[PDB]
Design an enzyme around this catalytic site. Structure first.
Site, PDB file in Angstrom:
ATOM      1  CB  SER C 140       2.177  19.923 -12.264  1.00 10.65           C
ATOM      2  OG  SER C 140       1.478  20.003 -11.040  1.00 10.65           O
ATOM      3  CB  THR C 145      -6.502  19.260  -7.982  1.00  9.18           C
ATOM      4  OG1 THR C 145      -7.494  19.246  -9.015  1.00  9.18           O
ATOM      5  CG2 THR C 145      -5.661  20.509  -8.113  1.00  9.18           C
ATOM      6  CD  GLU C 254      -2.083  14.047 -41.144  1.00  8.50           C
ATOM      7  OE1 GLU C 254      -3.038  13.762 -41.897  1.00  8.50           O
ATOM      8  OE2 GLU C 254      -1.553  15.174 -41.116  1.00  8.50           O
TER       9      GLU C 254
END
Ligand SMILES: Nc1nc2c(ncn2[C@@H]2O[C@H](COP(=O)(O)OP(=O)(O)OP(=O)(O)O)[C@@H](O)[C@H]2O)c(=O)[nH]1
Ligand SMILES: Nc1nc2c(ncn2[C@@H]2O[C@H](COP(=O)(O)OP(=O)(O)O)[C@@H](O)[C@H]2O)c(=O)[nH]1
Ligand SMILES: Nc1nc2c(ncn2[C@@H]2O[C@H](COP(=O)(O)OP(=O)(O)O)[C@@H](O)[C@H]2O)c(=O)[nH]1
Ligand SMILES: [Mg+2]
Lengths: 219, 436, 440, 184, 36, 44, 428
Positions: C140, C145, C254
């Site tokens: 996040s 951390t 891709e």
């Protein structure tokens, strides 16, 4: 029409009222000075010499051998009053004794912090200019004074944070009030580099500790 | 690994801390003897935050107890949960203080200090990784910070290097009934800021009002007043001890509540407080907690929040919950009264969800707030130094000891500038042009 | 043979992976104790676990995951939970103190104390690998951390593994709902590293999954567990063609060559359209056209920015289930006939299509439903610029008074790095502007 | 626009000596201020822009964001005073392959990075007043394999003091520079 | 005007997904014809 | 724009009044039907 | 969805509300301690209307109890259903009004309104959607009539769009219970005109005869007398709480009854009221039920509707029956006597039905009626007051508490126009 964190003012349609105020950026009522009581007594060896150069102070006794331990804290106490026949003696008398004499500005530093924060705490936009000029002049016109003020930044700087970003946003139209310096934010800023350039090492951190907007120069 | 050592000073640290340790012993499941009789495993998983294993299945706390009177912490060691403390942690003097602050700093300069430092050393070092310390004390007595700036000036030498919380009982604004009192209010400050900066200021007058108007207890002693603080102490450490969906330790609270390094003001509060006859008729929902913890009533500090601006808010909750109700608390109260949430900070609320609730209760919270209405707390002390400082009449008791009175006069100068620094960030707005 | 290592960093990243590896084990026949059951088979073998699991000699499947995190008692939930013997004890590695929502602490002070061990475990996990497609990270933008240690991880993984398809999943600070005050600081600092060391950075917001849980799933008071299952459903659909055969098998390589047009534009918008509760799922038919329509709906996005304020660049549609190619083409055609859905004129084709034959798998205790067919949308709009201009307004509002900066400067960084982090953000808005105005 | 202009050896877009120097320029002031006057070493008016946020308050030479001035002159020279604070500035150029391309120079950047739409480079100011010469025709060639056509924007950020922002046909020595373009 | 349900959500529902926070599935769309 | 000065004259045009309120040919029946099966002071 | 906040002020409003929450607990299965020992699910679905919900499966009523003063409702809290109320909703102060409108509205009603309004916002902010308020109180008292009408004014300033009901006991004609009765009645009716939209007029006298001529029990008390005003408060709002073939609410019972905003003083009643000896003598059918609904001796006001004309009639109904027989009969009872229904409204009668009858009855119905003949009540009161205000009897007990005699004159002025407006629509 409401107060705040109540059951009221949480509805879909409400209006409210805030606090009384915040007591910052506002002129504080002055107090009687020890400069006032000691001047009417006639203990000062000063005289308003009405020169044709503007006003000047004529000293009956020579400035070099004054008792600076009894006069510099007493002249600095006069900065927190604005009536003319006393405020000029505080403004000019401090500047006159600062640039005269040496090896005696140092011992009177720790008893100079109280009268220099009291005039700054008035928060009126006139003597804050005066106290900023003598703060620039105090560190320059002697030897080894900036190192003395490093442990005393905690009592001088909190007022300088409040008016640090006080400037004019005149983007193109030119101003003309640089002759007499009334710009607080330029005077607070220029005092800060005068504070940092002197005092040697461990001086930028003491300014960065308590006015964090400041950028540490002298890299 | 993360661990706390509890320092208790005075009667106040000792009586509040003893109630705190029985709370934590109930929360972790420790009997008054010291063994584990809990009904869960998570009550034991992180018990190396406040208790050490001693041989024999006997968990022993990590509190060192400090006082200058022998008598006070004999009641602590003979209380309900009182034999849990190891005797070597119980470090006593022989003579304390009384009457004069000037006595307090010209009395026992360095006798008891080094004895405590040995105990604080061994207890901290014989562990893994120190989260920090916590200190319970009050600002009062016959010494103020007279013993304080005597004893702790030897301990503050290196202590501000890690986390150190302080749940301090600030003087109450009622009457002056300590005769020569307004000399210990001025000489209290000095380093009142730059050695903890995580102080949870707790007033006793506000403690009674929550007991009178909110809890509706007819006869609140000092003991159940110490029950309210013990919930808050447990609240700010429950994410470290018990697991949660949104963890928040002491540093994560300290980082997310302290914008500037001179903010030792965190007014506490416990959300689900209800009277005994009204607990049955209670919804106990997420909005119900939020409307109480933000309320001026449920504030354990005598400062109404609507006198200033919330500089930053913490919302350490406990249970299975939501947090978006707190967002409506700004958006309603902030954007309408912008003077109740500081606008140059975009979002003023930290939230935390610790899964395990307090005992009995299903859901709870622990509010701490850096509101700029705490300018008034160090202003009542400010009109209570100036009022009697200038006469110096009964100060002839002080005068016999009578230290340097520049130190008398520099302490409030390191307090009114703190008020000014709070007055600034109450009046400072985003576009810094419109307040000059 | 084709495979990818999944990295989970932060309390957010660890909790995402727990509801994500719950899906992965249940998508295959893998039980929580690692071993597949002798009785009962989930389907054909096909060695499809190889993309996420490693096979041992005793008949045990082991996830190719590292749970690196400085917070000790969110990993110990895994260490005592149901998925105990699935993970190695040394795959799950913990610090001693948190970064405490500080980018500087997770990058400089605590981060260097654990960066050596996690790269050793990444190297050892990738040593037995043969044809490693890339890495997936989960974090996040608001944690210490999750932003600081994540940033240091891309710094080291860029030089250890060179140019490799390093996908990124992240959680944005919402415009309004935000659990931290220093959150605009962490997000603006970790994007300064994401913009140059992440090949593709998937962009996910909390408020939008809150919105689609209450509206589409019809659940009141959603928790972090429900947001965790929605994200893991999409990440399974991202790596869907790596394990199960389909009409149009589309690879991770891709994805990048068909989604991001320029090396800064790797911030796709995530959308999972057939998210629906069980009591209202089996009632109406779920055609492939109406779920392609629901991908372009403003409220079904998982980031709080509607594409009406922007212009689409490239859309990657990943269909699973009983989906034939021909009616996808009809669904794409009827989208192109609308002038409200704005497409840039330098992408006349616009769409990348992937069909898979394996329908999504339902978790017990979940809130989704068993659908015959489903779709994941990977949009790319200029509308993401307003999601970042708000973050700069949130950053500039509190950086100008130097709030919380000494909580960063003291822990091993200089004050100029904040202006350097806003700098690339001040250029990223103008980079999204210069690919938006029409060529004349 | 500056297209019908001859674009000779010299062209000035901002000069602090005049009625309205910031006439074509657009002013965006946010937690800062703009002023025009201070005589420290040169006894002349020099425009001040400074603020507590460097990336938020600035000035942009084309007022309308849709309009872009077209200057074919390769050398870009401004005279900027060092204030020992954070100073950045922009220049946007048009390339021979028709790409809107930008360059950035900053006080607070350690190493340089080049990639397709922005090239950021460090800069070391002198002790006091100095002029800096941003060779656009070389920086559009070293950073990318590209020739210079014309610049499109210049933008000057906070904590600097400005006088005589101008373009030149080629690099000039101090002696051959005319009297109104000198540092003193 | 609208040919199908996707354009009904896509048209002038007056719901900014950047600004609209915590709405209901009724106020997900607010057409201009509804207001006036 | 080709105009004429013989347009500044006020338009001095009033709306002709609407036709009078149409009395229905069945109204005389519904007066009698509504005022039927009515007496006074029966229950109370 | 649509829920009602109960308000009760004064001694009478709490004695009525004591028995009101007895029958609502009985209809909705709530026991004295607040746990649902019910039978069906229909008694639990629309339970949020009156009862809130607290942790423990406990259904706390949303009622707040208003008085100035703590030493009496031992009638409630030591009664059968007094533990159901939470102790926080009880609001009180120091000195009582004591049958004086000035004391309860100006002096002792100045500091309790802040406390009562604080509590009613707490009850009104825990809502998905507030349907409205309603009050039961006395009209000639000190706390019911003085404080109760001040609380009405405070809610109306704060919730103007919500609907407020008033179940007030208007003064008895023949034998009074308070000497200063018209002083409190006139000052409280004057505020009730513009601050309420559905006001109920109750005579204790009409309850006495209903208790005797219909209920046929020899020794009455206020237990079974307040039960008549109890089930009327219930039965009006059962369309909110229970479904029907076509149902109603408080709003639909107000827009379909109040033509002009100053005309909202109604007369309630009950159709099925028989003794144990009359159980075998009468048939509980719609024609027999609707006959005694419109009976003048059945009404809860001591003023006959025969003296004037009905402006608007409505009836709420219950039980699985035909809509045809109830529709054709209320046409039948409306057209047989047309001298009591206004000519300029072709249908004065509204029909609402429910599906769930009360326990003990297979079908029941409640009557509500707006008539011109309620001017009979106000015109007595108007000359009660000019018998006493004229000679300044009992006026120093009002003048000395801060009010003037002008407020008495505005109350005469407002009541006399309200009388004159009633007589205006008597003539068609
Ligand atoms: N979708 C989702 N987001 C989560 C979840 N858990 C945490 N988050 C996000 O994480 C943010 C909180 O900060 P974190 O990143 O978790 O902090 P951290 O990972 O513990 O890192 P440290 O602060 O150093 O301990 C919130 O704003 C959430 O958006 C989760 O379970 N699901
Ligand atoms: N809550 C609480 N407060 C106390 C207690 N004992 C003292 N205080 C407060 O502390 C003040 C004086 O205590 P103090 O003399 O400082 O105790 P000391 O620290 O041992 O000197 C009083 O005003 C009390 O309000 C206690 O047991 N509990
Ligand atoms: N129907 C009914 N009326 C009552 C009851 N108790 C009192 N009353 C009426 O209420 C009036 C007294 O008003 P009161 O409640 O004392 O006003 P307060 O002093 O302000 O509380 C009398 O005229 C009674 O007729 C009761 O139990 N039932
Ligand atoms: Mg964490």
């Amino acid at each position: 029409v409401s107060e705040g964190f109540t059951v009221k003012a949480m509805m879909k349609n409400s209006v409210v009222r805030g606090p009384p105020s915040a007591g910052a950026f506002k002129e504080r009522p002055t107090k009687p000075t020890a400069f006032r009581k000691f001047y009417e007594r006639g203990d000062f060896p000063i005289a308003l010499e009405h020169d044709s150069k503007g006003n000047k102070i004529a000293w009956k006794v020579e400035i070099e051998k004054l008792d600076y331990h009894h006069y510099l804290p007493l002249f600095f106490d006069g900065l927190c009053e604005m009536t003319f026949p006393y405020e000029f003696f505080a403004r000019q008398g401090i500047h006159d004794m600062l640039e005269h004499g040496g090896n005696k500005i140092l011992p009177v530093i720790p008893q100079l912090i109280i009268p220099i924060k009291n005039a700054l705490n008035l928060r009126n936009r006139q003597v804050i200019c005066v106290t900023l000029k003598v703060l620039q002049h105090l560190v320059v016109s002697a030897e080894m004074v900036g190192e003395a003020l490093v442990p005393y930044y905690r009592q001088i700087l909190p007022i300088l944070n409040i008016f640090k970003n006080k400037n004019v946003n005149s983007g193109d139209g030119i101003d003309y009030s640089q002759q007499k310096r009334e710009n607080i934010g330029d005077l607070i800023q220029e005092t800060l580099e005068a504070f940092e350039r002197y005092g040697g090492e461990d001086a930028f951190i003491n300014i960065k500790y308590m006015v964090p907007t400041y950028e540490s120069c002298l890299l | 690994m993360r661990e706390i050592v509890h320092l208790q000073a005075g009667q106040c640290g000792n009586q509040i801390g003893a109630k705190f340790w029985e709370v934590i012993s109930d929360e972790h499941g420790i009997d008054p003897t010291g063994t584990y009789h809990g009904d869960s495993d998570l009550q034991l998983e992180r018990i190396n935050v406040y208790y050490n294993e001693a041989t024999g299945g006997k968990y022993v706390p990590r509190a060192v107890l400090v006082d200058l009177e022998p008598g006070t912490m004999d009641s602590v060691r003979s209380g309900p949960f009182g034999q849990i403390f190891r005797p070597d942690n119980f470090v006593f003097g022989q003579s304390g203080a009384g009457n004069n602050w000037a006595k307090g700093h010209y009395t026992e300069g360095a006798e008891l200090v080094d004895s405590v430092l040995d105990v604080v050393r061994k207890e901290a070092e014989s562990c893994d990784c120190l989260q920090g310390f916590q200190l319970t004390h009050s600002l009062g007595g016959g010494t103020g910070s007279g013993m304080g700036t005597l004893l702790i000036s030897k301990i503050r030498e290196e202590y501000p290097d890690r986390i150190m919380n302080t749940f301090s009982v600030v003087p109450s604004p009622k009457v002056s009934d300590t005769v020569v009192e307004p000399y210990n209010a001025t000489l209290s400050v000095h380093q009142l800021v730059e050695n903890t900066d995580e102080t949870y200021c707790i007033d006793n007058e506000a403690l009674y009002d929550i007991c009178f108007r909110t809890l509706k207890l007819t006869t609140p002693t000092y003991g159940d007043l110490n029950h309210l603080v013990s919930a808050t102490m447990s609240g700010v450490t429950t994410c470290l001890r018990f697991p949660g969906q949104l963890n928040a330790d002491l540093r994560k609270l300290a980082v997310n509540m302290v914008p500037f390094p001179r903010l030792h003001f965190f007014m506490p509060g416990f959300a689900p407080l209800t009277s005994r006859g009204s607990q049955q008729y209670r919804a106990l929902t997420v909005p119900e907690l939020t409307q109480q913890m933000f309320d001026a009533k449920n504030m354990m500090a005598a400062c109404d929040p609507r006198h200033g601006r919330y500089l930053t808010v913490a919302a350490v909750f406990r249970g299975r919950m939501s947090m978006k109700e707190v967002d409506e608390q700004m958006l309603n109260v902030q954007n309408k009264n912008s003077s109740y949430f500081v606008e140059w900070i975009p979002n003023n609320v930290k939230t935390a969800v610790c899964d395990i609730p307090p005992r009995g209760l299903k859901m709870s919270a622990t509010f701490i707030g850096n509101s700029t209405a705490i300018q008034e707390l160090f202003k009542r002390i400010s009109e209570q130094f100036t009022a009697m400082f200038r006469r110096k009449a009964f100060l002839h008791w002080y005068t016999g000891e009578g230290m340097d009175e520049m130190e008398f006069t520099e302490a409030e100068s390191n307090m009114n500038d703190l008020v000014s620094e709070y007055q600034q960030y109450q009046d400072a707005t985003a576009e810094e042009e419109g307040e000059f | 043979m084709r495979e990818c290592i999944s990295v989970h960093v932060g309390q957010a990243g660890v909790q995402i992976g727990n509801a994500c590896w719950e899906l992965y084990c249940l998508e295959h026949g893998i039980q929580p104790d690692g071993q597949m059951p002798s009785d009962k088979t989930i389907g054909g073998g096909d060695d499809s676990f190889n993309t996420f699991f490693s096979e041992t000699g005793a008949g045990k499947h082991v996830p190719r995951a590292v749970f690196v995190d400085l917070e000790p008692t969110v990993i110990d939930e895994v260490r005592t939970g149901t998925y105990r013997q699935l993970f190695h004890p040394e795959q799950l590695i913990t610090g001693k103190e948190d970064a405490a929502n500080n980018y500087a602490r997770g990058h400089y002070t605590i981060g260097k104390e654990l960066i050596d061990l996690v790269l050793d475990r990444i190297r050892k996990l990738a040593d037995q690998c043969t044809g490693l497609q890339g890495f997936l990270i989960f974090h996040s933008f608001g944690g210490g951390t999750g932003s600081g240690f994540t940033s240091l991880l891309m710094e080291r993984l860029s030089v250890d593994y060179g140019k490799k398809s390093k996908l990124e999943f992240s959680i944005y600070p919402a415009p309004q709902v935000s659990t931290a005050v220093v959150e605009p600081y962490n997000s603006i600092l970790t994007t300064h590293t994401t913009l140059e060391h992440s090949d593709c950075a998937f962009m996910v917001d909390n408020e939008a999954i809150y919105d689609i849980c209450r509206r589409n799933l019809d659940i009141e008071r959603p928790t972090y567990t429900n947001l965790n299952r929605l994200i893991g459903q999409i990440v399974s659909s991202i790596t869907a063609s790596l394990r199960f055969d389909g009409a149009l098998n589309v690879d991770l390589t891709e994805f990048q060559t068909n989604l991001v047009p320029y090396p800064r534009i790797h911030f796709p918008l995530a959308t999972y359209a057939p998210v629906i509760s069980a009591e209202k799922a089996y009632h109406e038919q779920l055609s492939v056209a109406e779920i392609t329509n629901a991908c372009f709906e403003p409220a079904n996005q998982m980031v709080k920015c509607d594409p009406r304020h922007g212009k689409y660049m490239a859309c990657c549609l990943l269909y699973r289930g009983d989906v034939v190619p021909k009616d996808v083409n009809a669904a794409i055609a009827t989208i192109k006939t609308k002038r409200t859905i704005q497409f840039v004129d330098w992408c006349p084709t616009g769409f990348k299509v992937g069909i898979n034959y394996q329908p999504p798998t339902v978790v017990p205790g979940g809130d989704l439903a068993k659908v015959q067919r489903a779709v994941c949308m990977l949009s790319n709009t200029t509308a993401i610029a307003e999601a970042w201009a708000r973050l700069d307004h949130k950053f500039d509002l509190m950086y100008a008074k130097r709030a919380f900066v000494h909580w960063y400067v003291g822990e091993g960084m200089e004050e100029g790095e904040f202006s350097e982090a806003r700098e690339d953000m001040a250029a990223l808005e103008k980079d999204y502007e210069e690919v938006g105005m029409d060529s004349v | 626009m500056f297209k019908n202009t001859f674009q000779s050896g010299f062209l000035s877009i901002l000069y602090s000596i005049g009625s309205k120097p910031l006439q074509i320029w657009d002013k965006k002031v946010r937690n800062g201020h703009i002023k025009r006057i201070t005589d420290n070493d040169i006894q002349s008016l020099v425009l001040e822009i400074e603020g507590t946020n460097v990336s938020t308050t600035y000035i942009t030479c084309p007022a309308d964001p849709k309009k872009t001035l077209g200057i074919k002159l390769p050398f870009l020279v401004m005279i900027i005073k060092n204030l020992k604070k954070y100073f950045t500035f922009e220049v946007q150029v048009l390339d021979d392959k028709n790409v809107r391309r930008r360059f950035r120079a900053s006080n607070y950047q350690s190493t340089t990075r080049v990639k397709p739409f922005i090239c950021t480079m460090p800069m070391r100011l002198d002790d006091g007043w100095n002029q800096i010469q941003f060779n656009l025709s070389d920086f559009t060639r070293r950073a990318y394999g590209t020739n210079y056509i014309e610049t499109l924007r210049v933008q000057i950020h906070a904590n600097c003091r400005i006088r005589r922002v101008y373009f030149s046909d080629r690099l000039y020595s101090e002696d051959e520079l005319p009297a109104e373009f000198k540092l003193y | 005007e609208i040919p199908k349900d996707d354009l009904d959500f896509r048209l002038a529902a007056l719901y900014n997904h950047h600004t609209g926070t915590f709405k209901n599935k009724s106020e997900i769309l607010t057409h201009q014809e509804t207001i006036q | 724009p080709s105009e004429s000065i013989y347009n500044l004259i006020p338009s001095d045009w009033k709306e002709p009044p609407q036709p009078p309120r149409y009395v229905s040919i069945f109204k005389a029946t519904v007066k009698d039907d509504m005022q039927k099966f009515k007496t006074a002071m029966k229950t109370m």
